[PDB]
Design a protein around this ligand. Structure first.
Ligand SMILES: Cc1nc(N2CCC(C)(N)CC2)c(CO)nc1-c1cccc(Cl)c1Cl
Length: 489
């Protein structure tokens, strides 16, 4: 996504759409003031119309429109079929020409002030055949250096990128608009030098990996001058690669089964139901223990929800939201009252005992099917209630206490299905919950001296359900959650 400009103000996007843009030219904007606030500035009738987007933690809220999982799915929803983005006076908005950005800040291969001695050291210890990165030049203030490793017959070559009148080149041939256009060009058409060595640009140099023991020192660098914002928005510009097909949720017979019409499961990980429709807004997740990220249950999908728990042999349910938050409704009461028995379609649930903790409340439910005798299943529902309406908790210890108890219950039950996690839309809070549980389980097995990768773990999960982990505060909270886990060991 090149229509996203991470480091501009509201006035510049106005100037840019009025100078280098025609009608239909749009542009994405993060409001520098408030993190979690974005703007969709569209040029129309010689003026720029600013459409505000707010992400409290659960979804991207378009003002006057609908709710979307990512900003890529938002732009795709309006570009691919127009006629739904209106100024609500009746006049419609058109998204036709993405204003491309030249800022390389949030690219995998960009490192900025990274010198040449550290860059040579980094590629020697972490680079493979094809690793590369781009850095600012120290000798010539303004230029850039591309260092590539190809492989003691392993080498690290250096290609000097010169900047001439806001245009970049490698010494000869074409001159490009941005560093990205230069990198994307030689990533596809490799640079061959005199003696027949191809300078292959396979994957950028990995710097996000961490030996799990020394993570507190990485949080130090990331914390202030923002390293966390630099890493998150770098992760955010890879969401345009995860636009997999969501056709099963976009059809009429399934529209009233999604709490939010434009937050839909991927077809390749959706949980299909069998005994009867097959559709539920749910996705299987796995890096052993698996997960199922569901939405807040709608009244018309409660029976489908309990069908899924039975079919996947789930024994643990993680509720990371209240029933009513911020005015609207986010989850329907899908469990019977204490000591009560209710029938949900062919399914049957008995709430035998409720246990109130400080952060959460636990419900021991008994799930059985109508007709078949002696259907066991003790489903344990963990309802987290200390999560705030806006943002993330200020202390990771509350969730970590909640999550360690859930893991022990899962391991206690011999051969248990995936752990069901759900909030409002089932992408933000649950995305933060599932990622935290994935990272801790690695440090729970291989020990303290293992290697974790928060950005790689998130995109691995983001490939199975749209927009897992929503905000930078959720991204930062994941780091704080892992750090607090090490300090207790
Ligand atoms: C999010 C991220 N950020 C990086 N950087 C580069 C620019 C910086 C040094 N300024 C800040 C950190 C790097 C590089 O290893 N990888 C990632 C990543 C790691 C795993 C998966 C994915 Cl999908 C990404 Cl995108």
């Amino acid at each position: 996504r090149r229509w996203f400009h991470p480091n501009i103000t509201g006035v510049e996007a106005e100037n840019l759409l009025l100078t280098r843009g025609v009608d239909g030219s749009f542009l994405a904007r993060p409001s520098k003031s408030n993190p979690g606030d974005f703007t969709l500035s569209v040029r129309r009738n010689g003026a720029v119309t600013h459409i505000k987007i707010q992400n409290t933690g659960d979804y991207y809220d378009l003002y006057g429109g609908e709710k979307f999982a990512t900003l890529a799915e938002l732009v795709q929803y309006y570009m691919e079929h127009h006629g739904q983005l209106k100024e609500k006076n009746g006049d419609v908005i058109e998204l036709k020409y993405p204003l491309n950005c030249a800022d390389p800040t949030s690219e995998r291969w960009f490192h900025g002030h990274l010198s040449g001695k550290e860059a040579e050291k980094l590629l020697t210890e972490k680079g493979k055949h094809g690793s590369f990165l781009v850095r600012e030049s120290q000798s010539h203030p303004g230029d850039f250096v591309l260092s590539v490793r190809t492989g003691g017959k392993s080498k690290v070559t250096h290609v000097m990128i010169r900047c001439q009148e806001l245009k970049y080149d490698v010494g000869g041939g074409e001159r490009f608009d941005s560093l990205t256009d230069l990198v994307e060009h030689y990533k596809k058409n490799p640079m061959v030098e005199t003696l027949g060595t191809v300078l292959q640009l396979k994957q950028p140099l990995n710097t996000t990996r961490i030996n799990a023991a020394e993570i507190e020192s990485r949080v130090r660098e990331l914390s202030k001058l923002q390293g966390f914002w630099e890493e998150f928005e770098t992760l955010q510009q890879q969401e345009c690669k995860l636009l997999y097909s969501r056709k099963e949720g976009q059809r009429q017979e399934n529209k009233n089964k999604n709490r939010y019409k434009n937050i839909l499961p991927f077809d390749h990980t959706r949980v299909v139901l069998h005994d009867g429709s097959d559709y539920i807004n749910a996705n299987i997740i796995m890096p052993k223990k698996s997960y199922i990220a569901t939405q807040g249950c709608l009244q018309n999908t409660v029976n489908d929800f309990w069908r899924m728990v039975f079919q996947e042999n789930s024994r643990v349910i993680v509720m990371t939201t209240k029933e009513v938050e911020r005015g609207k409704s986010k989850c329907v009461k899908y469990w019977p009252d204490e000591y009560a028995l209710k029938e949900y379609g062919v399914m049957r649930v008995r709430n035998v005992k409720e246990s109130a903790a400080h952060d959460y409340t636990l419900r021991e439910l008994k799930l059985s099917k109508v007709g078949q005798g002696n259907t066991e299943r003790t489903v344990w529902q963990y309802h987290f209630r200390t999560w705030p309406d806006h943002g993330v908790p200020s202390d990771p210890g509350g969730v970590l206490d909640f999550l360690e108890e859930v893991h022990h219950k899962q391991e206690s039950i011999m051969d248990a299905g995936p752990v069901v996690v759900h909030c409002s839309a089932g992408i933000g809070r649950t995305g933060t919950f599932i990622v935290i549980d994935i990272l801790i389980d690695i440090i729970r097995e291989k020990g303290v001296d293992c290697d974790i990768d928060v950005p790689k773990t998130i995109q691995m999960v983001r490939s199975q359900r749209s927009g897992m982990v929503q905000t930078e505060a959720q991204y930062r909270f994941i780091y704080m959650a892992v750090q607090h886990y090490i300090e207790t060991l």
